[PDB]
Design a protein around this nucleic acid. Structure first.
Lengths: 117, 107, 271, 27, 88, 55, 65
RNA sequence: ACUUGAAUUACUGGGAAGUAACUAGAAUAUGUAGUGUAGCGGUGAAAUGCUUAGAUAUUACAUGGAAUACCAAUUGCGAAGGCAGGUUACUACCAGUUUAUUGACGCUGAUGGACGAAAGCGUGGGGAGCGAACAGGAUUAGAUACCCUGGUAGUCCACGCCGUAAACGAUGGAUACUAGCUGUUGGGCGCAAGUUCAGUGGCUAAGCGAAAGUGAUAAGUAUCCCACCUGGGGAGUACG
RNA sequence: GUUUAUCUGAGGCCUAACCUCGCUG
């Protein structure tokens, strides 16, 4: 139902325990998503370059057969896999044109939760 | 003392509305006992970020002189007008008045 | 707000209002109408709305809630006490010669000349339409229908706030916390209502409740099963699920009609 | 200095505090 | 306590010798002026302990000068307190 | 933001090293937990003293 | 490693010059430490408040790149 | 009688120094609308928890609360507690110097007054995040804890109440002397070098100290005033 | 698999039945 015009983005939101890739149209409508935990990697290996590569390649040649050729990847959050989440999209067809990083950082906004012992 | 206010207007206004708002703002000071020095209109400039989903605005500078006892009503009749989007009023002294003069004398 | 000394047991915890904003004690003779009180008895004579008796007969002062004299400035002449409401009145005298009894605001003193209409300034006391009250102002006496009067925020110490404006309606936060839409042509008065120190008044006495017009209220728990569905029982007993008199649950049960034709104007309930 | 000297003053001030807490609401 | 050069010159000339800015009488007059013009600000800024303490310090300085006058010349002390309405 | 124009591995390494240089790989691990001023004010008097004794 | 304001005769820091206020800001729109520019503390405070005033007046961006 | 102490005045400046009122952005949370399907979150590994009633993810808008990344620090101010987004109003204080002015007007200070972190108490609002107590999951022989998922008071605001801290430089306030080296803050004299006051760090000589250490901002040599100490426990306990 | 004339399930809009308010229609 969503238009798949050949200009889009890939939001790669990583963290300390997982990573989520979402290939999205140029208007915010998500086309195809994937996750390390979705690609049968439940455990302490969700935050790994191999898991990120598999999660990226899962949706790469899924959104590829939809009409997407050029991507404007937006990377967010810390954690491993930001490298081999763009590596195994640009090496799997669809071409990347930007590596914009949009990691949010508060300007002393909220109280961090109770430093852990 | 010596004050200087700079404010931005809504870019959807016309040339007749942006010329009917600045005069209503300037007649507010000349009625309380002020002396307008240099009223400048930079024009339709672009904003670094987006304000009210807009990325442009008409800038204006007043740079007036009036006692500080009539500076609260002047501030309320800035946030009670819906045509403005941002305003800033700062005081000047014998280190900024000279710079203002020498930069106004530089075209 | 004064705190009486504990001389008597009926005076230990009594707190008397200060009435510091009141100036004149004698009202205006031409703006007073006769009024009699009822003990809840309706026209036919049956006692509906029980627990209201009678005490200290009062007189009614004709309050001007419309304020449809636009462009004519009026000066405050005196701030007086009205027994028929909770807020002070503060009689006004117009420039042409009329005298009215509009309701007073929080910062309304004797000597202020206030103007009505749409071309007035958003100052305390002045009344303006919602299409010209700028934004987020603490307003009161909001009209619910154009040209009818004042309905919302009329008690001592209440106020509302403007939220937004969308073409024909403006969003307003009623004193109860309900967010609702009101036509833009409706009027309102800037500034909070008077008294504002009414919630701090303590009686410390059963006699003041009867001075005000109330009567003692018997608990249905200390009754017989023929009088209330909650009475009866050997010894001190409860009443099961609290009903009112006809089995209507009295805890959580909402009585607002779910098919109310005015449901298209409510944004939050908070009631 | 050493911590053993400052010690036992935590226990002496905790036992009294707990006793005063457990002896409240007595009347 | 908005004190200008002209106001100080006037409050010193009122006691005499406007160029004599060190006389105990002129100093006590200045202290009384800027204490009376500060206790009023303390009525709208009742939570301004920073200026309350400065007012207390000014009172202490004025009391020190009054004690100096009392110990040196008994007549000038009575004259100044009667003309300035001090000491209760 | 960290917009970086554009082989792919060269640009990816450039982006990764710019991300490591702009001081963020360790900026979020410090905000994950809460450090009160009483403990954030001693890591300065114990660091400046070390830098001074290292001179 | 000197102060460009103490070497010259500049005593004020204007905030209406977005082109001039770009010499004390990072490539991503952050105030540069005075260690890299040699500016004294008295003028570093002024240039910081001027950068903040320009940010408020929307002449310099908060989040840039 | 005098000006050196002290205070006032004049000129240059200095700051997160106070009280009140406005205003900005990032981020978190919630709601609406669009896209979309099976996970999300968490740990040393798991589970509780949210999810096919459409979550996590993404776009746009709106609402609300708290705190202000970079500047930013053995910086600076304040008697101390403490003070950090920006603007204005009302104040206060400090430093230097060509002035002019009074002439010991000074120091300390028992009773006493004022201020006084956080937590706590009363009344009325607000409540985004955090989170005492508490409820589940996990570890353990047990776990009334550490760990994980929720969460009330509280944290916030307007008036008040108590007056306690490792309220620490574990070093009371003054004045006067006694070697240097090396940064930095705000002034003066300087075309630069550099010099002189007022604050703030480090090394160290003599001198002190039981030693660790201190060392011109003394724990060095003197004088004045205040508070406190006299083995450990009982005990900051009993009584008033 | 679509088109043309009807029935029905739902939304949106209009005023012209029906309801309400302000000045006196």
């Amino acid at each position: 139902k969503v238009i798949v015009e050949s200009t889009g983005e890939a939001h790669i939101s990583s963290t300390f325990n997982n990573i989520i890739i979402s290939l999205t149209n140029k208007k915010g409508e998500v086309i195809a998503w994937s996750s390390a935990g979705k690609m049968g990697f439940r455990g302490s290996k969700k935050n790994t370059p191999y898991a990120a590569q598999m999660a990226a390649e899962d949706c790469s040649k899924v959104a590829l057969e939809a009409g997407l050729k050029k991507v404007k990847v937006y990377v967010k959050g810390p954690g491993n896999g930001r490298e081999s989440a763009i590596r195994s999209i640009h090496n799997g067809g669809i071409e990347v044109t930007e590596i914009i990083d949009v990691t949010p950082m508060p300007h002393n906004g909220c109280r961090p939760p109770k430093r852990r012992r | 003392n010596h004050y200087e206010t700079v404010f931005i207007l809504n870019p959807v206004l016309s040339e007749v509305q942006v010329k009917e708002t600045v005069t209503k703002f300037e007649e507010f000071l000349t009625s309380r006992g002020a002396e307008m020095v240099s009223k400048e209109d930079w024009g339709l400039k672009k904003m670094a970020y987006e304000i009210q989903n807009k990325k442009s605005g008409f800038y204006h500078l007043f740079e007036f002189k009036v006692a500080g006892e009539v500076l609260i009503a002047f501030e309320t009749e800035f946030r009670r007008d819906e045509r403005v989007m941002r305003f800033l009023t700062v005081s000047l002294d014998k280190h900024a008045i000279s710079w203002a003069e020498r930069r106004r004398a530089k075209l | 707000v004064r705190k009486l000394k504990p001389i008597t047991p009926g005076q230990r915890f009594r707190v008397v209002n200060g009435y510091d904003a009141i100036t004149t004690d004698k009202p205006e003779r031409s703006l007073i109408s006769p009024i009699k009180n009822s003990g809840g008895r309706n026209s036919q004579g049956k006692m509906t709305m029980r627990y209201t008796g009678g005490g200290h007969k009062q007189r009614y002062r004709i309050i001007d809630f419309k304020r449809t004299k636009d462009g004519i400035p009026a000066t405050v002449k005196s701030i007086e006490y009205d027994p028929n409401r909770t807020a002070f009145i503060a009689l006004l005298a117009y420039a042409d010669g009329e005298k009215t009894y509009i309701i007073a605001q929080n910062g309304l003193k004797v000597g202020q000349k206030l103007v009505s209409g749409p071309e007035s300034q958003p100052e305390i006391g002045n009344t303006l339409p919602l299409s010209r009250i700028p934004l987020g102002t603490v307003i009161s006496c909001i009209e619910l229908r154009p040209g009818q009067g004042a309905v919302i925020a009329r008690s001592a110490g209440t106020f509302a706030q403007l939220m937004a404006r969308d073409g024909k309606y403006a969003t307003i936060k009623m004193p109860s916390g309900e967010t609702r839409l009101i036509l833009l042509t409706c009027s309102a008065t800037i500034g909070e209502v008077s008294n504002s120190d009414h919630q701090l008044v303590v009686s410390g006495k059963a006699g003041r409740t009867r001075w005000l017009g109330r009567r003692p209220r018997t608990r249905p728990v200390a009754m017989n099963p023929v009088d209330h569905p909650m009475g009866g029982g050997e010894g001190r007993s409860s009443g099961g699920h609290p009903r009112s008199r006809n089995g209507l649950p009295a805890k959580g049960y909402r009585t607002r009609s779910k098919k109310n034709p005015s449901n298209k104007y409510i944004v939050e309930r908070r009631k | 200095p050493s911590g053993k000297k400052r010690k036992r003053h935590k226990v002496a001030t905790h036992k009294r505090k707990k006793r005063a807490r457990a002896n409240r609401h007595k009347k | 306590m908005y004190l200008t050069k002209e106001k100080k010159e006037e409050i010193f000339a009122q006691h005499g010798d406007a160029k004599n800015t060190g006389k105990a009488e002129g100093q006590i007059a200045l202290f009384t002026y800027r204490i009376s013009h500060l206790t009023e600000h303390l009525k709208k800024n009742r939570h301004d302990y920073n200026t309350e303490r400065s007012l207390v310090l000014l009172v202490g300085k004025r009391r020190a000068l009054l004690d100096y006058l009392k110990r040196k010349d008994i007549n000038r002390y009575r004259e100044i307190i009667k003309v300035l309405n001090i000491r209760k | 933001m960290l917009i970086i124009p554009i082989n792919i591995d060269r640009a990816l390494k450039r982006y990764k090293r710019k991300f490591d240089k702009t001081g963020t790989v360790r900026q979020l691990r410090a905000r994950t937990a809460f450090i009160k001023p009483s403990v954030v004010k001693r890591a300065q008097i114990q660091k400046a003293a070390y830098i001074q004794t290292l001179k | 490693k000197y102060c460009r304001f103490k070497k010259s005769g500049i005593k004020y820091i204007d905030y209406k010059d977005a082109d001039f206020l770009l010499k004390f800001v990072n490539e991503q729109g952050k105030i540069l430490p005075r260690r890299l520019t040699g500016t004294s503390l008295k003028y570093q405070r002024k240039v910081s408040v001027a950068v903040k005033r320009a940010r408020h007046l929307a002449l310099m961006p908060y989040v840039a790149d």
